[PDB]
Amino acid sequence: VAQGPNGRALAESMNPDLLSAIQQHISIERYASVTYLAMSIWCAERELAGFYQFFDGAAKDEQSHAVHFTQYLIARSQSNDLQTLDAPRQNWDSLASLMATAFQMEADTTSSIQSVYALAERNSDTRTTVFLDPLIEAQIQSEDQFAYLLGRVKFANGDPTALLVIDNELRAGQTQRG
């Protein structure tokens, strides 16, 4: 029985480029987390309590996704390499602009997973594509959800009255088309 790079028994070696891609993606999940924390704060600073609570939960969820990836590397007997985390964006001129950044962040998360997915297929790593399949499925739902929140905020067309109604929806947990 061979030992993998993290010291555990190795079921099958992993291509180093694929390992680096996964380590890089863990950073993207962690960056999404701190970005949603920043967005939560921006919302709280403007008394948008429902948006604040939504993004506060979204930040914890993104961290959970990152940890989920670290567990996969452990399972594959590969080393984790937790990286320096950039500071998030923290300033937006409107809620609509913030929600656009949030949507792009989800689309960018999926793109990163897709890039890892393509590299795993290049290396015939079926464990990794199977591991990523449910995460892409969750990304479709997340993109649908953030397209819903962004589009609903844009529908409000900057009217504070409409944004308060949407804010109360989010505080109630009404955060998807349903």
Answer for which of 41, 44, 74, 96 binds Cl ion (CB under 5 A) is 96
Backbone angles phi, psi at 159, to 5 degrees: -75, 115
Min. distance of Cβ 107 from Cl ion in angstroms? 20
By beta-carbon proximity to Cl ion, the closer residue of 134 and 155 is: 155
Spatial contact of 112 and 24, defined as CB atoms under 8 Å apart: yes
**Beta bridge partners of residue 9, listed in sequence order:** 3
62 is in an annotated binding site: yes
Q: In the numeric block, which tokens belong to residue 87? A: 């500071």
Give the position of tokens 């923290």: 90
| Helix axes 126-155 and 160-171, enclosed angle (nearest 10) | 140
Tell which positions 97-156 bind a second copy, by CB under 8 A.
Answer: 100, 103-104, 106-107, 110-111, 114, 117-118, 124, 126-127, 130-131, 133, 136-137, 139-141, 143-144, 146-148, 150-152, 155-156
Q: Does 80 bind a second copy (CB under 8 A)?
A: yes
* 46: DSSP letter: T
- Residues in contact with Fe ion by the rule CB under 5 A: 29, 62, 65, 106, 109, 133, 142
Torsion of CA 85, 113, 67, 5, to 10 degrees: -90
> Quick one: what does residue 72 bind among Fe ion, a second copy, Cl ion, none, with the CB cut-off 5 to 8 Å set by partner type?
a second copy
Give the position of tokens 């567990």: 71
By beta-carbon proximity to a second copy, the closer residue of 17 and 74 is: 74
Binding-site residue set for Fe(3+): 29, 62, 65, 106, 133
Binding-site residue set: 29, 62, 65, 106, 133
